[PDB]
């Protein structure tokens, strides 16, 4: 979830 | 160096320790430590998410893809680099987490310690059995970001391969660098990131019980947690693959 906003950012 | 070596990469792509933030003074408390690496673990994954963005064909990749490899090897990746830590000078084999949180001797003989830490021990007595160079810790590092995929390849899975092979030969310049036989040099190294493997997966059935018993008392970060309670009865279907050299 976040790991996806974290790698996409 | 036929210009910037992409091991002299990332070296510096390589990111920087972190601190425990252990009170220590308090007399020393099996969770209470445990409890502050998960705390750190987070950070440090953080911190290694940061550090793969930062590599060659990483964010070329489809994200969906990025985003389950380091899913994977996240265990891997944060058991290789401290190896390599306590391997650094710590010839009492004291496990060393953090440049504030080690552990000594006696320390390791607090509850259900030592039946854990034996695993993280294995790789830096096995670097230290291998005098690993930065440079081919660095390598090997990146290289177990790519230890594990789906059973079904990846969305981008020809690139996936493609960068892979990059950097098993980028560890080729690595250990030439110091010639001959080196071709042994290179079986041995290879199988120990194979041996990662098992090591990483003790881990996980170490890290899962005390992430699911409260009769532990143990609190991991929120970034573990997504990471966790995914990866968990996930991986638990042999729905991944453990990528190898030698079978
Ligand atoms: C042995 C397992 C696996 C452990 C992790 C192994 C990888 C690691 C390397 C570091 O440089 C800092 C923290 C971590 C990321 C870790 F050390 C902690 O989070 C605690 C942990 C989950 C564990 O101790 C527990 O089961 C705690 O309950």
């Known amino acids: 979830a976040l790991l996806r906003y974290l790698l996409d950012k | ?247």
């Open chain 2, 1 to 247: 160096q036929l210009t910037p070596t992409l091991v002299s990469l990332l070296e510096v792509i390589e990111p920087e320790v972190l601190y425990a933030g252990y009170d220590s003074s308090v007399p020393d408390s099996t969770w209470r430590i445990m409890t502050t690496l998960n705390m750190l673990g987070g950070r440090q994954v953080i911190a290694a998410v940061k550090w793969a963005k930062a590599i060659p064909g990483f964010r070329n990749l489809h994200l969906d893809d990025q985003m389950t490899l380091l899913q994977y090897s996240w265990m891997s990746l944060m058991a290789f680099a401290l190896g390599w830590r306590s391997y650094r000078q710590s010839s009492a084999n004291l496990l060393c987490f953090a440049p504030d949180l080690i552990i000594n001797e006696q320390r390791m003989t607090l509850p259900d310690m030592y039946d854990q830490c034996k695993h993280m021990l294995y790789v830096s007595s096995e670097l230290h059995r291998l005098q690993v160079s930065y440079e081919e810790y660095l390598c090997m590092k990146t290289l177990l970001l790519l230890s594990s995929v789906p059973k079904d390849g990846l969305k981008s899975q020809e690139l996936f391969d493609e960068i892979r092979m990059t950097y098993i030969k980028e560890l080729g310049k690595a250990i030439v660098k110091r010639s001959s036989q080196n071709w042994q040099r290179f079986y041995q190294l290879t199988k120990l990131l194979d041996s990662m493997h098992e090591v990483v997966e003790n881990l996980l059935n170490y890290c899962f019980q005390t992430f699911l018993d409260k009769t532990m008392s143990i609190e991991f970060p929120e970034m573990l947690a997504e990471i966790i309670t995914n990866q968990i009865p996930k991986y638990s279907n042999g729905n991944i693959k453990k990528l190898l050299f030698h079978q």
